[PDB]
A and B are shown apart, each in its own frame.
Chain A
Amino acid sequence: QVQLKESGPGLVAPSQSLSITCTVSGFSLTDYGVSWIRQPPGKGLEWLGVIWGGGSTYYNSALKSRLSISKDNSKSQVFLKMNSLQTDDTAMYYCAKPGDSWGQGTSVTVSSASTKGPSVFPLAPSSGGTAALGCLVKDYFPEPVTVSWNSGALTSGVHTFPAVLQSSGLYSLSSVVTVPSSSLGTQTYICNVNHKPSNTKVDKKVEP
């Protein structure tokens, strides 16, 4: 079954150029059109463009001039190129195929600032009937992370908070999971924290 996978930088400088590729499997691009949609944080969906089978490309009127969509059937790939990026262009970027399935999306932040990986500190459990624990993901930039527990295995009771801005202008969040106090001794909990844009992968033993 069809899947689409986007890949792109995560952070880019204003006025520079953006490149995202969508790698597609489970269908052939001679047969299907792939379109691009972006979503700026807290805003709605905006349609960027599409490339048809023998594409033949159409764009979004407003952005038409800044934008090029091309593809490579052979490599099973579609490219989105955008230039003179402003901070307005900060969005989650998706590619998409009765229709119709979307990629996960790639977060793209336009800022002149540089990348910083997160520090991860454990939120350790202590002294009704259930207990919380967690990890603190402090000062990183840009979005996002992308926190999990036991490399997938744990997904219920888990909350991962939206990133908040520090006065430093860096982001931080916490990821907590609830468990029963009983399980605390015998069960072991590790949080796996990824920050694509800085190439940081961290795992943390969370002990009582």
Chain B
Amino acid sequence: DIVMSQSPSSLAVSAGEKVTMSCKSSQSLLNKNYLAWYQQKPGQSPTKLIYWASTRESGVPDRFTGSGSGTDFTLTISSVQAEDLAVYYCKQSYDLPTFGAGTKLELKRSVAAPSVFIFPPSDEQLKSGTASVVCLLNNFYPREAKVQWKVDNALQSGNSQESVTEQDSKDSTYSLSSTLTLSKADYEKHKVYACEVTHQGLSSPVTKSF
């Protein structure tokens, strides 16, 4: 097998910028260079962008430029859009095909405060002796937030897990869920439930609560 070396592994970039990413091959690819470029959007299911190094696929923009030859190859985006947020892979096809490790292209953008929603446990779930309280942080940037739970002013720990979305394909923002897990028992003993959120795009911490 031919080792395919791609770089950089990751790229943070404002929508205006021009970006270029390299892919070197331990061996030459010429018979036509049998180099291809693929794009994978947040899954999705990768699409082929460029073949024989530089010829783009059907319906693919003029912003995507493939170049280089034999051993060193380049992929260029001229004015990256938010929608270009994806990971890009190169594939040599000269031998038994192999992919580079890929370049994650992350979109940079301006700081955006989260809108914060809280969700009490559903009656249905409580009849199972468990209680999930959910705190949602919608559409923010950066990634990249502290979420703290308070029950009856009592700070919590070890009782929550967070899940972060992939960056949004149209506005480049994140969303986050925080989930407090309790037993029906611990839950019913208490009245006030709060998440307190601190974030770069926030003058002072925001707390949602029921």
Interface residues of chain A, those whose CB is within 8 Å of chain B, are 35, 44-47, 58-62, 92, 94, 98-100, 102-105, 119, 121-124, 126, 128, 130-132, 134, 136, 138, 159-164, 166, 172-174, 176, 178
- Is the beta-carbon distance between A47 and B99 smaller than 8 angstroms? yes
Residue of B nearest to A144 (CB): B43
Interface residues of chain B, those whose CB is within 8 Å of chain A, are 1, 36, 38, 40, 43, 45-48, 51, 57-58, 89, 91, 96-102, 115, 117, 119-122, 124-125, 128, 132, 134, 136, 138, 161-166, 175, 177, 179, 210
Task: Pick the most buried of B1, B96, B101: most chain A CB atoms within 10 A of its CB.
Answer: B96
Residues of chain A within 8 A of B122, CB atoms compared: 121-124, 136
Bound form: Cα–Cα A127–B46 in Å: 41
Interchain residue pairs A-B with the least CB separation, the first 6: A161-B163, A132-B117, A123-B119, A121-B125, A121-B122, A45-B99
Residue of A nearest to B1 (CB): A61
A–B complex contacts, Cβ < 8 Å, 14 sampled: A44-B102, A47-B96, A62-B1, A94-B45, A99-B36, A105-B43, A119-B125, A119-B128, A121-B121, A121-B122, A121-B124, A126-B210, A138-B125, A162-B164
Residue of B nearest to A99 (CB): B48
Bound form: Cα–Cα A136–B40 in Å: 28
Residues of chain A within 8 A of B164, CB atoms compared: 161-162
Residue of B nearest to A176 (CB): B136
Given contact pairs A98-B51, A136-B134, A46 touches B119 in the complex (Cβ within 8 A): no
Bound form: Cα–Cα A174–B57 in Å: 37
- Is the beta-carbon distance between A100 and B96 smaller than 8 angstroms? no
> Which single member of A61, A126, A173 contacts B163 (CB below 8 Å)?
A173
